[PDB]
Design a protein around this ligand. Structure first.
Ligand SMILES: O=c1[nH]c2c(Br)c(Br)c(Br)c(Br)c2[nH]1
Length: 325
C-alpha cells in the first residue's frame, strides 16, 4: 500500500526536513508568557490561555506533561514545517521551566467555542464552510508530507465570530514514507479508521479522511460520536453494523488481512444501513443528496477509494463555499 497522492514529498526534500531528531530546539523565555486561565486538558498536556507580557497579545500556552524528548522533537518539527500554511495552528515560541525543564508550547490564540456547544448552533452552510476550512488544513499538511493522525472535533479550534478555524494538536502527527509500517495505536477511538482497527500498518494520508468523515457524519446526523465503540473491537463492530460486512471482507482480501477469531465473532454478519437511515426530524435540514454523496465517498473501508483532501474540496457539496471564495 502507498499513498495515491503526495507519496514522494519527503523523499525529494533534503533529509533535514523530515529527520526530526536532527533538530536542536532553540529555546525561549518562559517569563514572556503568563497563564491567564485554564482552557483545556488531555493525556499529554494542559492548555492555558496566556498573555505575551512584551506586547500584551493573547496567546495559548500548552504545558506538556513529562514527555519523551524524541516525541516533542516530532511535534515541534511538524509545527515548524507547517507554520504559515492554511488553517494550521501557528507555533509562536517554545519555552521551558528553568528548574524542572518541562516544555510549554506557545501558540496563536483562538477564541474557541467548544464543539459540543458550537456544533448544534451551526447552519447547513457553516457546516460546509468549516469542513472546507479543515479540508484546506488537511490538503496542506498532506502536501507537505504530514499525516495528522488525530483528526477530531476537539482538535479543530473555531472562533465562530471571525469564522476562523485552526487544526491543532499535532502530537500524533507523522511524516509520510512509502512502505513505512506505522503504529495503529494512533488517532482517537471514534475516529480510528478501519485500517488501524484491522492492523493494516502501511496506511497514509487517507486515514485523516476517514476521521474527517466520522466527524462530518456526526455533524450532519447529530450523532456524536457517529461511531460509538467502547473498545478497539467494538469500534470495528460499530463500523460494520453500518457499512456492512460484505464491504469489509473484500477489503480484508485486498490487503490480505486476517482478523483474530475474537474479532471475527464480535463483528459477525451485517447488512449495510443506508446513509439515509440516519436522517431524522432533528438533522433533516443538514442532509442533502450532496451531503450523503460526499460522506459516502469519505467513509470507505478501503483507504484507497477515499477522497483525497484536494478532491474533497471540489465536491459539488462545497460549491457555494468555493463560489463565495
Ligand atoms: O487542548 C487545547 N485546547 C486548545 C485551545 Br481551547 C486553543 Br484556542 C488552542 Br490555539 C489550542 Br493549541 C488548544 N489545545
Amino acid at each position: 500500500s502507498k499513498a495515491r497522492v503526495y507519496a514522494d514529498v519527503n523523499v525529494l526534500r533534503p533529509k533535514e526536513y523530515w529527520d526530526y531528531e536532527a533538530l536542536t530546539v532553540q529555546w525561549g523565555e518562559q517569563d514572556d508568557y503568563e497563564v491567564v486561565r485554564k482552557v483545556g486538558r488531555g493525556k499529554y498536556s494542559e492548555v492555558f490561555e496566556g498573555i505575551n507580557v512584551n506586547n500584551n497579545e493573547k496567546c495559548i500556552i500548552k504545558i506538556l506533561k513529562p514527555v519523551k524528548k524524541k516525541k516533542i522533537k516530532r511535534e515541534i518539527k511538524i509545527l515548524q514545517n507547517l507554520c504559515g500554511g492554511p488553517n494550521i495552528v501557528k507555533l509562536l515560541d517554545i519555552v521551558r521551566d528553568q528548574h524542572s525543564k518541562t516544555p510549554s508550547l506557545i501558540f496563536e490564540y483562538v477564541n474557541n467555542t467548544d464543539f459540543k456547544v458550537l456544533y448544534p448552533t451551526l447552519t447547513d452552510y457553516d457546516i460546509r464552510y468549516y469542513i472546507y476550512e479543515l479540508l484546506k488544513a488537511l490538503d496542506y499538511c498532506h502536501s507537505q508530507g504530514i499525516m495528522h493522525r488525530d483528526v477530531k472535533p476537539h482538535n479543530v479550534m473555531i472562533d465562530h465570530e471571525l469564522r476562523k478555524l485552526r487544526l491543532i494538536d499535532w502530537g500524533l502527527a507523522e511524516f509520510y514514507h512509502p512502505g513505512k509500517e506505522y503504529n495503529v495505536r494512533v488517532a482517537s477511538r471514534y475516529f480510528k479508521g478501519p485500517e488501524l482497527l484491522v492492523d493494516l500498518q502501511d496506511y497514509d494520508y487517507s486515514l485523516d479522511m476517514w476521521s474527517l468523515g466520522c466527524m462530518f457524519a456526526g455533524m450532519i446526523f447529530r450523532k456524536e460520536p457517529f461511531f460509538y465503540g467502547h473498545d478497539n473491537h467494538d469500534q470495528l463492530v460499530k463500523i460494520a453494523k453500518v457499512l456492512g460486512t460484505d464491504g469489509l471482507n473484500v477489503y480484508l482480501n485486498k490487503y490480505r488481512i486476517e482478523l483474530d477469531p475474537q474479532l471475527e465473532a464480535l463483528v459477525g454478519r451485517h447488512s449495510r444501513k443506508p446513509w439515509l437511515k440516519f436522517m431524522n426530524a432533528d438533522n433533516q435540514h443538514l442532509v442533502s443528496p450532496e451531503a450523503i454523496d460526499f460522506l459516502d465517498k469519505l467513509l470507505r473501508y478501503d483507504h484507497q477509494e477515499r477522497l483525497t483532501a484536494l478532491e474533497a474540496m471540489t465536491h459539488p457539496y462545497f460549491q457555494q463555499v468555493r463560489a463565495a471564495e
